[PDB]
Amino acid sequence: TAPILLLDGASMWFRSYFGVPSSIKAPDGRPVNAVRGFIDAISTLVTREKPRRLVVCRDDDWRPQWRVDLIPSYKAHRVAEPEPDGVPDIEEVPDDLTPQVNMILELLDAFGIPTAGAAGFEADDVLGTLSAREERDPVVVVSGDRNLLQLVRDEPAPQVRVLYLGRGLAKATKWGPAEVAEQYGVPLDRAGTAYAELALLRGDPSDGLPGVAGIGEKTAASLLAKHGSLQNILDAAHDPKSGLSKAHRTKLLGAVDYIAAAETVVRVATDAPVTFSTPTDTLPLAAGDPARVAELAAAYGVSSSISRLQTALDQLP
Ligand SMILES: [Mn+2]
Ligand SMILES: [Mn+2]
Ligand SMILES: [Mn+2]
16 A cells, blocks of 8 residues: 655754755745755655655654653753753754745644654654554654664564655665665665664764664674563573673673663663644645635745645645
């Protein structure tokens, strides 16, 4: 069947911010380069994948404090102003990008394109939850965030693929367990989960996660190849029985607290309390509020992008 497309909104509109010139502006002079690029990406995806179901996954909290509680360095270098309790921290975002996110969200709401979020969770968690739950159609997760390669799945069906944006949407291809295993050396039979365990061990500087000192990606791969899983690796270390080297034992035992804390940080949540802005995840074939869509698109200088999206929708069987 047609795939359901699950879109990592922030990954995509950050990409369009940096991929479309800032001289693309609304009639009031505000840049709309990210708005244009993001709407154009939806149209490209609709044409390429021909989905019947599409969801733009939101970051109701781009840096959940429950992750920060576990590893305080998590995303810390990207915070402009920390906010207390459940108020999301102020992310360091260009001043001319923040209004464009508001424009995008306004357009999506007026059009009736499904968006989904979960309070105190990232879009990453919405994606993992909607991917894990899906029972009817193959899933395509659209993102440039490599940590989401942990979602790849073949069985149990339906399959999950990541349309990885690291080189842009035009060059993007679909990653499954095979591709993740081939590129990161994790075992095929549990490539997605093993990828998250490799990423935990080796670290993720972009997310502020140091990893385990002395266990780089090569060592992490060989230990997963030999012991199968992170849990088995820790077992081998806590257990003078095994053929684990004393050096690897020391490095792992010296990081038991970090490893336990990082597991829940690195893994996307799969049971997040996702809610939708729409009654279903069906992609509307025309704007739910066409007058408001036309007025917003004119005000935001993306009338032709919206028109091209409606042409893409019109060609769906
Ligand atoms: Mn906070
Ligand atoms: Mn992420
Ligand atoms: Mn994210």
